[PDB]
Amino acid sequence: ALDDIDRILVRELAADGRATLSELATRAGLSVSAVQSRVRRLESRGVVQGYSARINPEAVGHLLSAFVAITPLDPSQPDDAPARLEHIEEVESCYSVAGEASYVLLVRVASARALEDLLQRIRTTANVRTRSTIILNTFYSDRQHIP
Amino acid sequence: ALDDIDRILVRELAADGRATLSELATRAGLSVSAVQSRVRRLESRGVVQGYSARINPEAVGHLLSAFVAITPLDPSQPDDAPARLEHIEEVESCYSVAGEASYVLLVRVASARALEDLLQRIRTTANVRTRSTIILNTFYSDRQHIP
Amino acid sequence: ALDDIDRILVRELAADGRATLSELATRAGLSVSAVQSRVRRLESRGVVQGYSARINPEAVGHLLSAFVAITPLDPSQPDDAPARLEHIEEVESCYSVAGEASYVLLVRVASARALEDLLQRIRTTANVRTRSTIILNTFYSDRQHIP
Amino acid sequence: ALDDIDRILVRELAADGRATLSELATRAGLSVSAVQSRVRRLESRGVVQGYSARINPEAVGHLLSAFVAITPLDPSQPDDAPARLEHIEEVESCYSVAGEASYVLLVRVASARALEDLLQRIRTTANVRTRSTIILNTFYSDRQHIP
Amino acid sequence: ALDDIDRILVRELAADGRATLSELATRAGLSVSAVQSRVRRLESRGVVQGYSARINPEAVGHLLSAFVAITPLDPSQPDDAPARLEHIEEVESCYSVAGEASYVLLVRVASARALEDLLQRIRTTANVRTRSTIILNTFYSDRQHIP
Amino acid sequence: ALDDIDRILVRELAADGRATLSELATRAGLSVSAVQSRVRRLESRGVVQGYSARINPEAVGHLLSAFVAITPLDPSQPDDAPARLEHIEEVESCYSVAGEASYVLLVRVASARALEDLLQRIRTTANVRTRSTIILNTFYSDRQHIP
Amino acid sequence: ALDDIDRILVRELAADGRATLSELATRAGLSVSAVQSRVRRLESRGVVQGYSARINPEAVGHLLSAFVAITPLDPSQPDDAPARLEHIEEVESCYSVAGEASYVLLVRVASARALEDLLQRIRTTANVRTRSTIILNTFYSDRQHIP
Amino acid sequence: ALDDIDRILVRELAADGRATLSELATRAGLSVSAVQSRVRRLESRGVVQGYSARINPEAVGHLLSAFVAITPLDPSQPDDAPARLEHIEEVESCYSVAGEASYVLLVRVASARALEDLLQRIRTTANVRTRSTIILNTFYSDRQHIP
To answer: Is D133 helix (H, G, I), strand (E, B) or coil?
Structure first.
């Protein structure tokens, strides 16, 4: 389970990763000592996995994002595509999926011509066919819901 | 504008969004005041969009994730869909996309029966057909790359 | 849970629904009294739902079977298609599904021309579009696996 | 040949596969000996293929069901697939089908991670691509109709 | 009923629809009166549906042939489409079909521009979307087989 | 070209293959001598290719018809699929096509199980993958239009 | 027809639009007077339609090109989509097509976000659904072949 | 670099590729020497890629145009296809593309039979499957836009 003070803690940290032990103690109703305990334990148990600023990809030069659906070409070989593409830094996310493809990647790249290159690199390195869906706009991203 | 100092700062914040200004200052070769100032500008421009604790979706009860591709029943109407689905809390992300669908959603839910009720809700509020792809495993996600 | 005498009981009843309390007591290792207890309780709790002979559909005049995928046309209306088609006797099975369609039916019919009629009946009664996949041959059906 | 007595018997056995011969006899207007004889013939012809307890898949730990459509990587080879997948126990049903896929499987499994490993197994043993459709709910199933 | 004499007659008429009764009689071992009588019955039952000269479509100016698969814009309505398209003379054949489309048409036309105007006509009179597949060559057609 | 007495001749023979030189001379406006000339020349030049009675396929035991789209698997081999399947008598028609497939066949068969067999025979003999579309009903077939 | 001096003229002008009446007279084998005649007549008759420099689209700020397939939503309305989109300057080309869509456009735009906007403008102005295919790279374009 | 003078020049050359330097000079407010110099630089940079007479494809005997989408039979191989098809003269354009296919070709040909032979050639030289979409009409094309 998860007591609903740990739920108020995770709610508030999902919405503001830089919120201080201080201002959390007001809204939650504990002490700067007791708050800091719960948080460190939330992280010990893999409930909060880390803290990140959310960087706009366009600002840092990633003008084209895509979903890339991939399917291993040779079923007699071990299916290790995620581990094989792990070193490719333009792959942001890798999920296995129940659909037509075996995996979906989210990929970010400087331009359409850089995507073409990345696709070929993905195909020759993991040994897969690719089908990509270009993203035109993010309306919102990672709004984590804590029930 | 995005200089070498700014690149350093966005890197460090992507990797650790609770990094204190003092830690950031010594890593950038700056004073804490100059750091805080740079960081405020990153935030006011579009570059840093927020900070969030990365929460484990399974630990808070979201045992089933899915991509949902959606297509408007009447695409001639100017398109409402992201604003209308904004109020459904189990929608985590919304992207518009090229190809057959108009948008892809990432959605998270307690179970199979909750997925089916969520899909009815999405069909009705956005006036859309849905195509769903269940996520079986997340190998890695949100690995932001600053070039 | 389920103790692994109840597991040997369910294994053996999945494979032979007409097996007698007698011959079950040998293989399982109980008494004709103790076996009959476990079974009646397996049925009380919804573990065994019933007993059926497996009828060949072709023998009884059902020469064409199909999967029929259906999608409600109007998302402003309640989605009650399964309850609406419940009285149609040629629908053997109805599942909701995460894919392109909302439901998949398994349907059995006398001929291709009777399928055309059934499809129109399905469309006008539930208020859905249909996409059907014709079955050419059953290799095996309902081999229940008890882990 | 399928007379009115035989139709009665197959009906009663579809609805209750543990019906005793005496119950069957009085419902068909026959002696127990004539009943038993008719029933043996139904079994020896292709008409009654077996008897099974209908077991609740969730009660024995099969929390995830799926349709899997499969297409041979090399369709020129005469096709092996049903015999090869026969030894995978989580495959419950196998149908050959017209349209884009060659066969549809109904499959049952403990979880999402078990589904993904099962799909690798199916791709490799049958030499096939897979397309998966997760079942969210079974509204009704196996409702056999004798016209 | 379709005896060995009837099979002979339908064979000969499929291969030569202007065969005279006398020729037919000596091939069937019958009198001309018995022949004429058998043939009338084939016609009155559903077995022989008409006689036609096989005309070369290119010789009469039909330089472009196409399959057109059609799907109703509103499939809940009971379906009109064959009766409505019956009055378009360039529609040669109309079949209802299982799968994604509802009907397939074979259509013949003078040219590319005439095809495009025909497709607008089909979309509007039947209220359908169209999917077109141009025929490049007819290798053989109408080779009727009597088993 | 084709004079519009030859057009009235072809119109009337498309509609009635058994029409006599006699009754054609009335409607057309020639003599039993002059009619018979034009017809024999229409056949000399490949304008009328033959005469056929139109046999109902269901009457002769062909209860299932399909379109079968086929694509050669090996582009290094000559593409002779039509000539290879020419001896298979259940293929009524063979067209090359501009679409996803290279050819479309119309095929007629006794049952769903006979189609499965035919499909495998097609695949192993020509060296192709198959995708089939089952026909549920013919509304009208070969209505030849003479402009 | 087209004499094969007019063919050498069109061959050479397809390859070099700025070639002078002078250097054309050598290769072709005429006089600076006779060359200039043929060309002006080639243009009079709509054989050469104009002369254009081939501008690199990326150089002028068009970093994303797409094919956009469009289908009119309402078949009761006149189908005038090409004339309706004629004033939209980012549509470079408009073809009617025999396939799933009614028209294919080639479109050029500054970015993925500008494509999203253009797509909505296309949909609301002509009254159509859109399906787009993003171009990643042009290998060669408009190599006109003169047989 | 692309200044206001350069924009003027590329505009005028897109609209009339045989414009003489003197005409260009007075339109740009420059000397003929400065014009010629600017134009040489546009050519040497990547901006003006060539000049071509726009030839009417139907006037030189290309009565049938098509898009052909192509997908490699083995996508793991680094991809050859544009260089290999470069030597087929009826291929006018070649684009790589995102989505299901890898490239789209625009192709032009004398007739239907020539299309079918061209498609065999494309399948074999590039080792690809093909999907063809016939163009029925070109409403306008090559309308280059300089923003």
So the answer is: strand
Single-letter amino acid code for the residue at H140: Y
Residue E56: helix, strand or coil by DSSP? coil
Which tokens in the block code for residue D33? 């000996």
Q: Which two tokens stand for residue E128?
A: 């359908």
**Residues E113, E118, E124: CA angle, nearest 5 degrees:** 135
Chains that touch E (3 or more CB pairs under 8 A): C, F, G, H
Triad B41, B47, B49: Cα angle to 5°: 100
Looking at CA atoms only, how far is residue B74 from chain G in angstroms? Answer: 8
Which residues does chain A have within 8 Å of residue B98's beta carbon, measured at their own beta carbons? 133-134, 136
Residues contacting residue E31 through CB under 8 Å, at least 6 positions apart:
E25
**How many other CB atoms are there within 10 angstroms of residue A78's CB atom?**
11
Contact G97 H67 (CB under 8 A): yes
Whether residue D28 contacts residue D35, with contact meaning beta carbons closer than 8 Å, is answered with yes
Query: Is H120–F75 a contact, with Cβ atoms under 8 angstroms apart?
Result: yes
DSSP summary character for residue C143: -
Q: Please give the angle made by the CA atoms of C69, C74 and C79, to the nearest 5 degrees.
A: 65
- Residue C76 neighbours by CB distance under 10 Å: 8
C-beta of residue G125 within 8 angstroms of C-beta of residue G73: no
Q: How far apart are CA G34 and CA A105, in angstroms?
A: 63
For residue B109, the tally of other CB atoms under 10 A from its CB is 22
CA E52 to chain centre: 10
To the nearest 5 percent, what fractions of chain C are helix, strand and coil?
A: 35, 30, 35
Say whether A117 sits in a helix, a strand or coil: helix
Residue pair H37/H79 in contact (Cβ under 8 Å)? The answer is: no
Method for structure elucidation: X-ray
**Which domains does chain D carry?**
3-54 (1.10.10.10), 55-135 (3.30.70.920)
Return the structure tokens found at G97: 């097509």
Decide if B40 contacts A70 (C-beta within 8 A): no
Measured between alpha carbons, how far is B108 from B141 in angstroms, rounded to an integer?
Answer: 15
User: Residue B90, exposed/middle/buried by CB under 10 A (0-12, 13-18, 19+)?
Assistant: buried
Location of structure tokens 């996995």: A49
d(C-alpha B117, C-alpha H92), whole Å:
51
CA distances from A69 to A102, F20, H53, H100 (A): 7, 65, 42, 10
DSSP state string for E53-72: EEE-TGGGT--EEEEEEEEE
d(CA F82, CA E138): 10
Structure tokens at D56: 């609740």
CA distance F38 to chain E (A): 14
Q: Cα(E18)–Cα(E43) distance, rounded to whole angstroms?
A: 15
Spatial neighbors of H146 by CB under 8 A, at least 6 apart, are: G55, G60, H7, H10, H11, H14
Residues ≥6 apart with Cβ < 8 Å to E63? E109, E110, E111
End-to-end CA distance of chain D: give it in Å, rounded. 15
3-class SS at A105? strand
Query: Is the distance from CB of C109 to CB of C62 less than 8 angstroms?
Result: yes
Q: Which of C129, C130, C132, C135 is most worth mutating to test chain E (most E CB atoms within 10 A of its CB)? A: C129
What sign results for the dihedral spanned by CA atoms D28, D33, D37, D40? positive
Going by the DSSP 8-state scheme, the letter that residue H44 receives in this structure is H
